[PDB]
């Protein structure tokens, strides 16, 4: 609504790894056949159709925007898991938080080595 | 960890073990040579110290 | 299960980072030396 009415919005799904679990429970109780790790087949779609709504409308469509900051939770840093990889291949950037950095004193634990942002140059003030 | 983590760690440790075995062999050869060359130098240096402990 | 060349830096454990640093420090030093020599040659070859 906000992005369609020329305003700017920010949405923070927290977590998406629990929406995936709720969807899996629904799908298993409707008797739909399971998939990998028991998640339904349509588990990528579930998220891709949801994170694709965070657009940046041009000035003809109001100019409004909707940023999204999905939050995923990995297991012992296994970024290679199923839902983490799906959402990593869906989103633009990433912000890797690591426990080894959290306890080494670096807080926020952002792992600047791996954290990425496709926009990069653009969307940054000239001084910064 | 997962299977790939364990596989990579196992391969790395196997390489490390190979390298340390090779280095042990090299060090043993160099040690044998060093002992062989140390005997005469042992007598030579002990002689050179002779004076001070005698006077 | 076997082992292959260049596996210590594929795991990326402690030995991988240790080796990467042991390489980078040495080659930074040699690059500094070579740059000094390059500057000296530049100056000595102007004439």
- Give the C-alpha separation, C7 to C1, whole Å: 13
Chain C environment of B8 (Cβ under 8 Å): 7, 10-12
The answer to whether the beta carbons of residues A17 and A11 sit under 8 Å apart is no
Question: CB of A80 within 8 A of CB of B2?
Answer: yes
Question: Are the Cβ atoms of B16 and C8 closer than 8 angstroms?
Answer: yes
* Method used experimentally: cryo-EM
Q: Is the CB of residue C20 less than 8 Å away from at least one CB of chain B?
A: no
Domain around C4: 1-43
Return the number of other C-beta atoms located less than 10 Å from residue A3's C-beta: 21
Q: Does C4 touch chain B (CB under 8 A)?
A: yes
Residues A57 and A4: beta-carbon distance below 8 Å: yes
Q: How far is CA A55 from CA A52, A65, A89, A97, in A?
A: 7, 6, 17, 25
Q: What's the resolution in A?
A: 9.4
Helix/strand/coil (H/E/C) assignment for every residue in C2-43: CCCCCCHHHHCCHHHHHHHHHHHHHHHHHHHHHHHHHHHHHH
Are C11 and B6 within 8 A, CB to CB? no
Determine whether the interchain pair B8/C4 forms a contact, defined as Cβ–Cβ distance below 8 Å: no
Instruction: Take residue A39 and report the two structure tokens written for it.
Output: 């998640």
Q: What's the number of domains chain C is made of?
A: 1
Q: Count of CB atoms within 10 A of residue A128's CB? A: 4
B-contacting chains (≥3 CB pairs under 8 Å): A, C
Q: Would you say B3 and A79 are in contact if contact means Cβ atoms under 8 Å apart? A: no
The phi, psi pair for B23, rounded to 5°, reads -70, -35
> Residue B18: its chain C contacts at CB < 8 A?
3
CA–CA gap between residue C5 and residue B51 (Å, rounded): 57
Q: Do C11 and B18 make contact, defined as CB atoms within 8 angstroms?
A: no
Chain C residue at shortest CA distance from B10? C3
Kindly report the CA angle at A86 between A80 and A87, in degrees rounded to 5? Answer: 105
Contact B4 A80 (CB under 8 A): yes
Q: CA A93, CA A41: separation in Å to the nearest integer?
A: 25
Is A118 one of the catalytic residues? Answer: yes
Are C7 and B12 an interchain contact pair (Cβ–Cβ within 8 Å)?
yes
Distance from CA of C6 to the nearest CA of B (A): 8
- How is residue A68 annotated by DSSP? E
Omega of the bond leading into A11 within 30 degrees of 0 (cis): no
Report the CATH number at residue C27. Answer: 1.20.5.500
Q: Which residue has the tokens 């949801």?
A: A50
> How distant, in Å, are the alpha carbons of B30, B41, B47 from that of B38?
12, 5, 14
C19 touches chain B (CB under 8 A): no
């Amino acid at each position: 609504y906000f992005r369609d009415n020329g305003k700017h919005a920010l949405i923070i799904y927290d977590d998406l790894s629990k929406q995936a679990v709720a969807y899996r429970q629904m799908s298993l109780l409707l008797r739909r056949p399971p998939g990998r790790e028991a998640y339904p087949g349509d588990v990528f779609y579930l998220h891709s159709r949801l994170l694709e709504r965070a657009a940046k409308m041009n000035d003809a469509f109001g100019g409004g925007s909707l940023t999204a900051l999905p939050v995923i939770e990995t297991q012992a840093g296994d970024v290679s898991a199923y839902i983490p990889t799906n959402v990593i291949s869906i989103t633009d950037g990433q912000i890797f938080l690591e426990t080894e950095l959290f306890y080494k004193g670096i807080r926020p634990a952002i792992n600047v080595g791996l954290s990425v942002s496709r926009v990069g140059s653009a969307a940054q003030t000239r001084a910064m | 960890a997962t299977l790939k983590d364990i596989t990579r760690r196992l391969k790395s440790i196997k390489n490390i073990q190979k390298i340390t075995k090779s280095m042990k062999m090299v060090a043993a050869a160099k040690y044998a040579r060093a002992e062989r060359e140390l005997k005469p130098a042992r007598v030579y240096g002990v002689g050179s110290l002779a004076l001070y402990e005698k006077a | 299960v076997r082992s292959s060349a260049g596996a210590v830096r594929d795991a990326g454990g402690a030995f991988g980072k240790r080796e990467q640093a042991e390489e980078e420090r040495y080659f930074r030093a040699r690059a500094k030396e070579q740059l000094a020599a390059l500057k000296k040659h530049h100056e000595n070859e102007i004439s």
